Design a protein around this ligand. Structure first.
Ligand SMILES: [Mg+2]
Ligand SMILES: [Mg+2]
Ligand SMILES: [Mg+2]
Ligand SMILES: [Mg+2]
Ligand SMILES: [Mg+2]
Ligand SMILES: [Mg+2]
Ligand SMILES: [Mg+2]
Ligand SMILES: [Mg+2]
Ligand SMILES: [Mg+2]
Ligand SMILES: [Mg+2]
Ligand SMILES: [Mg+2]
Ligand SMILES: [Mg+2]
Ligand SMILES: [Mg+2]
Ligand SMILES: [Mg+2]
Ligand SMILES: [Mg+2]
Ligand SMILES: [Mg+2]
Ligand SMILES: [Mg+2]
Ligand SMILES: [Mg+2]
Ligand SMILES: [Mg+2]
Ligand SMILES: [Mg+2]
Ligand SMILES: [Mg+2]
Ligand SMILES: [Mg+2]
Ligand SMILES: [Mg+2]
Ligand SMILES: [Mg+2]
Ligand SMILES: [Mg+2]
Ligand SMILES: [Mg+2]
Ligand SMILES: [Mg+2]
Ligand SMILES: [Mg+2]
Ligand SMILES: [Mg+2]
Ligand SMILES: [Mg+2]
Ligand SMILES: [Mg+2]
Ligand SMILES: [Mg+2]
Ligand SMILES: [Mg+2]
Ligand SMILES: [Mg+2]
Lengths: 80, 82, 86, 205, 61
RNA sequence: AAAUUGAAGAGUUUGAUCAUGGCUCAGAUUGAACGCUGGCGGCAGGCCUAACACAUGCAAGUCGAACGGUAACAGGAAGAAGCUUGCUUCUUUGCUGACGAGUGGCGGACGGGUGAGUAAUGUCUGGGAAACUGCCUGAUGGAGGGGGAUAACUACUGGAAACGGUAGCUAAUACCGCAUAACGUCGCAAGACCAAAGAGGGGGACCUUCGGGCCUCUUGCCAUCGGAUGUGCCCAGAUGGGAUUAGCUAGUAGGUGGGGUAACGGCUCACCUAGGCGACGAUCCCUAGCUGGUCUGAGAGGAUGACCAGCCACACUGGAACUGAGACACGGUCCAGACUCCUACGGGAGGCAGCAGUGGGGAAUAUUGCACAAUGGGCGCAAGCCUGAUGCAGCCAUGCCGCGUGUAUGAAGAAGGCCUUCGGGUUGUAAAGUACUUUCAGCGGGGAGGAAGGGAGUAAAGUUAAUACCUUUGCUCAUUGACGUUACCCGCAGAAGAAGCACCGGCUAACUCCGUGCCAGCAGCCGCGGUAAUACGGAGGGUGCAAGCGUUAAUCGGAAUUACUGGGCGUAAAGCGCACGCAGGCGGUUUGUUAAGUCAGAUGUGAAAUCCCCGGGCUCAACCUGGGAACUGCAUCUGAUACUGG
């Protein structure tokens, strides 16, 4: 129901914060080629149950700091 | 506040008003929330000269949109006609 | 000022500033008293200042300079400080 | 805003009769319309692909008495409208007030019809119109005004419009000097010596 | 720049105000512009009958 | 029923041909300039450069139904003082008309102008919570009781002026504390705290200090929660070039606590962690307001931001803050710098990138014009005032559209000119002559529409004690236009007052002589002139356009010549000298699962404007307008599972 975005994590070397990467599959407006574009975001991962590589799911709630407005919901793909 | 008023969009010596709901702090023919009918003082016979939307006018006056002088003098004519 | 309206409005504004400066400084001093009592570490002295600063920080909200949200935030912060003291 | 000069040099240049004369005098007796005008009409020059299209468009323009800008506007309207572009252009050209009144027979020539239209003698649907380019709609009522019904040239044109061809899309009556535009003329109804494709090819550039 | 005077006869000399338009001369290297006659000081060609507008010549009576 | 009506090549490498490829040309458009010419009307446009500085006039004022009062007028309401039986004086103006200045609140943050800066803090599309809101409006409560002054005014007094100072006089919707006040604030609760302004028309009795008390109507005053508008903030995707700009960032990334904003947030502070951005272009340089839109293009695309409309930024330059709900404010404040101006030398005044207009720049961009009569704004309950926005007038052919500059006859094929083979033809029905019209320009009359509103009375309804006073509904007389010698119609007479420009060797529609002789000169290309020039200048003739014609500057097409639609790499330009390989690109075959892309349907939005389709109004058109379609996009929901993807 609530608009949520699933993406792979990049870094977790921050207090209560991680860096997620989203791979949106879009088509080139000119050549019609289907490429992938990064959508790197900073997520306020309270109680960081996340490492590197595992995919997570985030939702936008409100601006929590200067450069993040997203919060974690669930962790799927946790096994490495 | 929101006000029902006119907006000239015709030509020189041939006016044609588009009755619209617009904020008071706006130009005569600038930005308006919605368009409600029209008016033509030089409209010939056997043709529409006023097509006000009384339903929308009532809806806006229920929310507090004030009606200007000419549109107030035209809504009564519309009610008298039909 | 060229226009008479602007010429009189400048005098109006400077007189309003002169009047409001004293009123703002008064409540600033009263809030400073509460903060000093809080940092002192006395619950009784903190409340004895809070219960009299509250009327002067609430009467101006529906009077001008300060706002309801600002008054509520200041009152909540001071109440939290009093509660956490000692 | 109209041609003011010889009415037979254009016909000689085009090579055929442009109907710019009333018809009382024979076209061959009126002028030596066999060759192009000027001092070099004896030679027969081989006309190019652009040349034939330009000559056709100029012939149509001079026959209908319009200018280049008005002809371009009419072509744009024909292309905008649905159906055959050339047929629509021909119908629009033969829909002007001067053209329709000439076809009815109130004017000797195109110039005479245009002058009658301009001088406030033609009335359409009981309304005074002095526009030579005034388009006429189906089921209209063109009529000579009461003041101009007693014109010697008008009645001469009325009596001289009979011995020539008669359009089958107009309802004319000289007793009251009035006519009705029953329906839009067709390509077969109009002249068959005009190449429609040349004009559209020329204007496709 | 270096312009090219058109026609025959030009009273212009040093310290003369002229008007310059585009258009070069094919058979002259370096020139890329043309002095337009009938300008502030560039007088038109005398006794001109054809294409008088291109050389700034008053219409004869 | 319609929003699909869409695709042109040519010249030039060579003794000759093909292909590649370069240049140029035909077409359309502009905020256009230049040269020649030039009649009218309608609709639009008119500093693209010096955001160069400004003489001068006007652009934001109004409210006495808030208050003290009367400095000009009038009724001199009005007792009125020596009343010339209208003459003068205090005045009465918390009596009525009204009123310069003053206090108070409202408006100045709207309207108007510009694109310097900003390549992202800006703009467009789609979402979100963490907040405000004068004026508009709904619901529920209340307006009880007093103070201290202050401007005006008055006596001085410094300065040339800007401007001030000194002691009282005094007002209120200016200010403040009491008391009441929760669905308001704080607080887990208990509990603690926060507001006020009165005015206007009347009225019998009850009434009176003889000013009045009291009832109703009218508008305000407050506290809370709502509706609309305006907003402030965040995220996602897009928004010029340069890599001959490759590392940048230490309040910088995050965290704890405090402070701050109406609101979330390193917005800020103290501490701790060493992180964050970056070949999906970080950082830096130049350029540039963005969008709907406009031109061109069949389409995809390219260029562009003229007018109008939505947003942002700016107001001599820079910094700052206050009043104000709303500004870090064009005609508000303070300070620093330049400029200009007055001076008694001590000291002061101003910011046209507003309407006009001035001085310079330029190739060029308008009159120091009328009116609030309408549409709106600001003030006022109203009447009423302001409004260089707006409605309009003036100039310019700057663009589009329409009309005219006569028509039907008219072969003695008049005269003259042009060439000629001297017999001829061309100008040419062209001209002259005859007949017939008067559109447009001029004169004289008639004459709509843009006018709905407002005041004064009258009948009815809502009101109360009331036939007073108010509001509303109909009725009758007053009324109102700058445009405006309006659009338009009618009579006068006369064919008058009304046509020029470019080109003519091929591209491209148009040929013959005269004057020179690679000289004079033409030119976008091919190229011409050395005595036969259809290419130079003129003449005759012809072609195109038309109140316009050509040149110039820019854009798109042709250019399939940046090719995603739509190219090539053996020899014209194009396979790295070869191999390995990271990121990346793609990927054999079957099943099940997911449904991210993809496919179907629905919802919201994709502003208005503009294009297109069907109709209407301007006598046609330009132009305006109603509806439809379209806005090719995005987000969400419900399904389909063949393909790609997990
Ligand atoms: Mg024209
Ligand atoms: Mg067609
Ligand atoms: Mg050759
Ligand atoms: Mg400018
Ligand atoms: Mg500019
Ligand atoms: Mg300036
Ligand atoms: Mg004025
Ligand atoms: Mg201001
Ligand atoms: Mg700029
Ligand atoms: Mg008050
Ligand atoms: Mg109280
Ligand atoms: Mg009180
Ligand atoms: Mg914090
Ligand atoms: Mg193309
Ligand atoms: Mg702009
Ligand atoms: Mg100014
Ligand atoms: Mg100006
Ligand atoms: Mg100059
Ligand atoms: Mg007005
Ligand atoms: Mg004034
Ligand atoms: Mg002769
Ligand atoms: Mg009228
Ligand atoms: Mg040539
Ligand atoms: Mg191309
Ligand atoms: Mg190729
Ligand atoms: Mg090679
Ligand atoms: Mg080679
Ligand atoms: Mg090799
Ligand atoms: Mg190598
Ligand atoms: Mg899916
Ligand atoms: Mg879909
Ligand atoms: Mg019509
Ligand atoms: Mg739209
Ligand atoms: Mg699969």
């Amino acid at each position: 129901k609530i608009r949520t975005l699933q993406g792979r994590v990049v870094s977790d070397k921050m207090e209560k914060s991680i860096v997620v990467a989203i791979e949106r599959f879009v088509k080139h407006p000119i050549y019609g080629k289907f490429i992938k574009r990064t959508t790197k975001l900073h997520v306020h991962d309270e109680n960081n149950e996340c490492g590197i590589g595992d995919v997570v799911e985030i939702r936008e709630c409100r601006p929590l700091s200067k450069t993040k407005s997203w919060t974690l919901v669930r962790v799927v793909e946790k096994a490495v | 506040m929101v006000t029902i008023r006119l907006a000239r969009h015709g030509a020189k010596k041939r006016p044609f008003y588009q009755v619209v709901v617009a904020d008071s702090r706006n130009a005569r023919n600038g930005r308006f929330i919605e368009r409600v009918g029209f008016f033509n003082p030089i409209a010939s016979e056997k043709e529409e000269g006023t097509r006000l939307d009384l339903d929308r006018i009532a809806h806006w006056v229920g929310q507090g949109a004030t009606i200007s002088d000419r549109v107030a003098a035209l809504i009564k004519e519309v009610n008298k006609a039909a | 000022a060229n226009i008479k309206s602007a010429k009189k409005r400048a005098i109006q504004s400077e007189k309003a500033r002169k009047h409001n400066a004293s009123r703002r400084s008064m409540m600033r001093t009263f809030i400073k008293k509460v903060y000093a009592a809080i940092e002192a570490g006395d619950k009784a002295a903190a409340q004895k200042a809070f219960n009299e600063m509250q009327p002067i920080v609430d009467r101006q909200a529906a009077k001008g300079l300060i706002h309801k949200n600002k008054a509520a935030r200041h009152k909540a912060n001071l109440t939290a400080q009093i509660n956490k003291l000692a | 805003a109209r041609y003011l000069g010889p009415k037979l040099k254009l016909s000689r240049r085009e090579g055929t009769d442009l109907f710019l004369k009333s018809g009382v005098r024979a076209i061959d007796t009126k002028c030596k319309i066999e060759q192009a005008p000027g001092q070099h009409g004896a030679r027969k020059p081989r006309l190019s692909d652009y040349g034939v299209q330009l000559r056709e468009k100029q012939k149509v323009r001079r026959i209908y008495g319009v200018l280049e800008r008005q002809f371009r506007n009419y072509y744009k309207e024909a292309a905008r409208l649905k159906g055959n572009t050339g047929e629509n252009l021909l119908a629009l050209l033969e829909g002007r007030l001067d053209n329709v009144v000439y076809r009815m027979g109130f004017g000797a020539t195109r110039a005479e019809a245009r002058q009658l239209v301009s001088h406030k003698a033609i009335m359409v649907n009981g309304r005074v119109v002095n526009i030579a380019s005034y388009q006429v709609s189906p089921n209209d009522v063109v009529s000579i005004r009461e003041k101009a019904k007693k014109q010697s040239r008008v009645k001469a044109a009325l009596e001289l419009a009979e011995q020539r061809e008669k359009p089958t899309w107009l309802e004319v009556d000289a007793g009251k000097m009035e006519g009705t535009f029953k329906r839009k003329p067709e390509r077969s109804d109009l002249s068959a010596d005009i190449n429609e494709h040349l004009i559209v090819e020329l204007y496709s550039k | 720049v270096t312009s090219y005077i058109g026609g025959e006869g030009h009273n212009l000399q040093e310290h003369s105000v002229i008007l310059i338009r585009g258009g070069r001369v094919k058979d002259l290297p370096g020139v890329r512009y043309h002095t337009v006659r009938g300008a502030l000081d560039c007088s038109g060609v005398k006794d001109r009958k054809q294409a008088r507008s291109k050389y700034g010549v008053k219409r004869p009576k």
